[PDB]
Symmetry: C3
Subunit: 94 residues, 3 copies
């Protein structure tokens, strides 16, 4: 912050005006630089949103896979029951 920096310069061989204008210049470049960085780079907030979205895709796929697994298990049981019926039929006619 401004005070303790302007305060420091004044008490180490600078004027009021010299210390404030120096600090005005430091702030000026700081703020334009940060502004350029925040625009060009990826913020942690943007990253968090992207990651949540990718985890939402992964969760939807996992959910589908579970459902398909359950549907294959049901088909397997029905196939089992038909195998028994068919084996029984073969015996009757055979």
């Amino acid at each position: 912050d401004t005070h303790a920096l302007v305060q420091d310069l004044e008490t180490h061989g600078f004027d009021k005006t010299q210390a404030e204008t120096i600090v005005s210049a430091l702030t000026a470049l700081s703020n334009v630089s940060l502004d350029t960085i925040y625009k060009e780079m990826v913020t942690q907030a943007q990253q968090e949103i992207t990651v949540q979205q990718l985890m939402a895709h992964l969760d939807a796929i996992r959910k589908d896979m579970k459902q398909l697994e359950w549907k294959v298990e049901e088909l397997l049981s029905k196939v089992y029951h038909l195998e028994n019926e068919v084996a029984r039929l073969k015996k009757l006619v055979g």
Copy 2:
């Protein structure tokens, strides 16, 4: 950029040489610090490439999931058809 900053210092109790050397120091640190940031941090253009790659992986898995779903559906239709055939056969053999 340089001008209005050196201009400001000179007109607030600094020399030509004092204002330029100050500004030379600000530039020096700004430029090395930015250079270190632009190298160490992720740009939007790099993010986009990474995200697209992750979305391509997710799309391939979704596409494999769809094909497997279709293949289970086919199996389902065949099992249904065998259920009906077997029920018909049981009827014939009395």
Copy 3:
């Protein structure tokens, strides 16, 4: 880093104390800015770790996918074999 900057100021119309306090101010703002940037933005090192974690989730899903594929193959074989048995049975009774 500090030296050649304090050295430059002194030799261009500044004191020992004036040159060091200026440089102390440049360091102060540099370091708070960088600290704010490192907290708010995504580094390449962070990105690599996040990407590896997402790829570990994708690899777990691809692994589960293979096991479900195997299970569909086992259903398919059983369904195919029942189709043949049934086709044969229909001929015998038909």
